[PDB]
Amino acid sequence: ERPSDLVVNRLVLFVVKGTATSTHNTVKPLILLEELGVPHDIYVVEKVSAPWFSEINPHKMVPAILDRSPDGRDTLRAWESTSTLMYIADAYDKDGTFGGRNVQERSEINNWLTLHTAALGPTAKYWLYFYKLHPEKLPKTIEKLRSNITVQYDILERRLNEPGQQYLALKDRPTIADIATLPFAMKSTAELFGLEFEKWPKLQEWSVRMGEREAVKRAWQRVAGFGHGEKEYGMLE
Amino acid sequence: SERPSDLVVNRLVLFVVKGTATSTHNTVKPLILLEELGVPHDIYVVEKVSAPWFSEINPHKMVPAILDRSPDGRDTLRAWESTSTLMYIADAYDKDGTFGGRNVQERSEINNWLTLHTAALGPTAKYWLYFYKLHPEKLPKTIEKLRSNITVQYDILERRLNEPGQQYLALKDRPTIADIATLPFAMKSTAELFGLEFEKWPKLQEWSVRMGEREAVKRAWQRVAGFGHGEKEYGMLEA
Numbered sequence: 001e002r003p004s005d006l007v008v009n010r011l012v013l014f015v016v017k018g019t020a021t022s023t024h025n026t027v028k029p030l031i032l033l034e035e036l037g038v039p040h041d042i043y044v045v046e047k048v049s050a051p052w053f054s055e056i057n058p059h060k061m062v063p064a065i066l067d068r069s070p071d072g073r074d075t076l077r078a079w080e081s082t083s084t085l086m087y088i089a090d091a092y093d094k095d096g097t098f099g100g101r102n103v104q105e106r107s108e109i110n111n112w113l114t115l116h117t118a119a120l121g122p123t124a125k126y127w128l129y130f131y132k133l134h135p136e137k138l139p140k141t142i143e144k145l146r147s148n149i150t151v152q153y154d155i156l157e158r159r160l161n162e163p164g165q166q167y168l169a170l171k172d173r174p175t176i177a178d179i180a181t182l183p184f185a186m187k188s189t190a191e192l193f194g195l196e197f198e199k200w201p202k203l204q205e206w207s208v209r210m211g212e213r214e215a216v217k218r219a220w221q222r223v224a225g226f227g228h229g230e231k232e233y234g235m236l237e
Numbered sequence: 238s239e240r241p242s243d244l245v246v247n248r249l250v251l252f253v254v255k256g257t258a259t260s261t262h263n264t265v266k267p268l269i270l271l272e273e274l275g276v277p278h279d280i281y282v283v284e285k286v287s288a289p290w291f292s293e294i295n296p297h298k299m300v301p302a303i304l305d306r307s308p309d310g311r312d313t314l315r316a317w318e319s320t321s322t323l324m325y326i327a328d329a330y331d332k333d334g335t336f337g338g339r340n341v342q343e344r345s346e347i348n349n350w351l352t353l354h355t356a357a358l359g360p361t362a363k364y365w366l367y368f369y370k371l372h373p374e375k376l377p378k379t380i381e382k383l384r385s386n387i388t389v390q391y392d393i394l395e396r397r398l399n400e401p402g403q404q405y406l407a408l409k410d411r412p413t414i415a416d417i418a419t420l421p422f423a424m425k426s427t428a429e430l431f432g433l434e435f436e437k438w439p440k441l442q443e444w445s446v447r448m449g450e451r452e453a454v455k456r457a458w459q460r461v462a463g464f465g466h467g468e469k470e471y472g473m474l475e476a
């Protein structure tokens with residue numbers, strides 16, 4: 001049984017209470033919702049271990065999405081941050097502004113999106129797990145994961161040093177590849193990993209360029225505040 | 238840094254390495270979809286993924302990678318990361334959405350189960366193999382935790398395949414690029430390598446056999462094992 005306040009009249013983005021370490025994945029779909037101006041609700045999950053939530057996301061994490069299918073026949077779900085970006089782009093990015101307009105654009109977008117999904121994303125998550133959450137400290141494992149993060153920054157830096165390559169996938173504009181990468185490739189996160197972000201200057205310039213976008217600013221503000229307003233958990237007003 | 242003499246792009250070129258039990262579980266993924274769709278393609282066996290010319294194709298310096306002609310045939314494009322090679326082949330060659338998804342509903346579940354593999358089981362399996370075989374020092378506590386995380390991913394797949402009529406991971410009716418991406422890390426041989434009893438996940442085992450019975454999957458496994466063991470060891474294989 002779902003909570004009484006969980007209804008799907010539009011896209012519902014599932015998040016947790018905003019903290020330094022709880023927002024770096026949930027901010028990704030929120031950035032794209034803000035960029036495209038998609039109507040949406042915010043549901044603050046008290047416990048991702050709740051049986052009702054595992055029916056939405058079997059991996060028992062945020063972000064997750066419930067939405068009405070375009071024909072209204074089904075309730076659709078998206079879970080895994082990369083999948084939430086793919087879903088929003090499919091349903092709402094009509095012109096492929098962030099999803100890609102043609103096979104050539106999508107070939108590069110999917111390369112840099114998947115690189116984050118498979119390499120930096122999971123490496124960063126395992127680094128955080130062993131550094132903070134694992135009952136035993138395994139410094140040899142932590143150091144190897146930190147080393148792997150620097151290799152991923154090296155790859156992103158190489159790409160952004162190519163002539164006229166202002167963004168990761170396309171030269172001209174940011175895509176879901178850029179949105180997926182940003183939260184794990186910015187000064188604050190680099191400092192958490194114990195890295196000097198200035199040692200990747202084109203990657204830092206790129207992170208500031210993305211950070212100056214109004215949709216990205218709004219997304220970061222809102223994800224920090226969720227659960228700290230008038231309502232702590234459930235459907236926000 | 239100059240491309241080898243025998244590297245030309247007159248059609249889709251799939252970059253692989255010499256076939257072994259632990260060198261084919263990512264390269265087999267695009268090869269399965271190519272065989273399912275009957276896409277014309279060449280095979281290029283890379284001797285050293287560390288070679289500068291190869292890093293210009295895949296900056297992550299791994300297989301699989303693809304070079305192909307653009308739709309209009311005037312330009313060359315690239316796909317790298319196994320999940321990206323599946324998304325590209327589906328975009329360029331699966332116009333009926335048989336494996337890529339025909340509508341927003343289908344693609345929502347395809348992308349959920351494809352991304353779950355790309356983010357969770359795939360990278361966890363890769364880290365497991367790295368610490369087990371490749372890392373200069375054995376870290377058994379790390380290896381054990383990664384092995385435990387694999388069993389959690391198996392539990393999720395088992396739950397999905399226990400749902401009424403859910404014959405495949407994403408769609409009830411047919412396999413998709415989600416199923417193709419998952420199969421190589423969710424079959425008896427790979428489970429045995431991880432030191433797991435695959436029988437503990439009966440619906441997952443039944444699914445792996447159902448996928449394995451497909452003629453395109455049989456052709457992919459037989460071919461990927463042989464790359465680099467034929468009359469030509471490295472470079473562009475003769476079709």
Ligand SMILES: N[C@@H](CCC(=O)N[C@@H](CS)C(=O)NCC(=O)O)C(=O)O
Pocket residue numbers: 016021022023025048060061062063079080081082121125356
């Ligand atoms: N692979 C997932 C990871 C998401 C993730 O790590 N979410 C955290 C943010 S706090 C979570 O749900 N953790 C809550 C918990 O398990 O306590 C993605 O990229 O979406």
Ligand SMILES: N[C@@H](CCC(=O)N[C@@H](CS)C(=O)NCC(=O)O)C(=O)O
Pocket residue numbers: 118254259260261263286298299300301317318319320359363
């Ligand atoms: N995340 C990548 C991983 C691919 C991967 O692990 N590739 C290995 C398989 S052998 C590789 O290229 N190794 C080169 C070598 O050492 O021969 C994907 O899913 O495509």
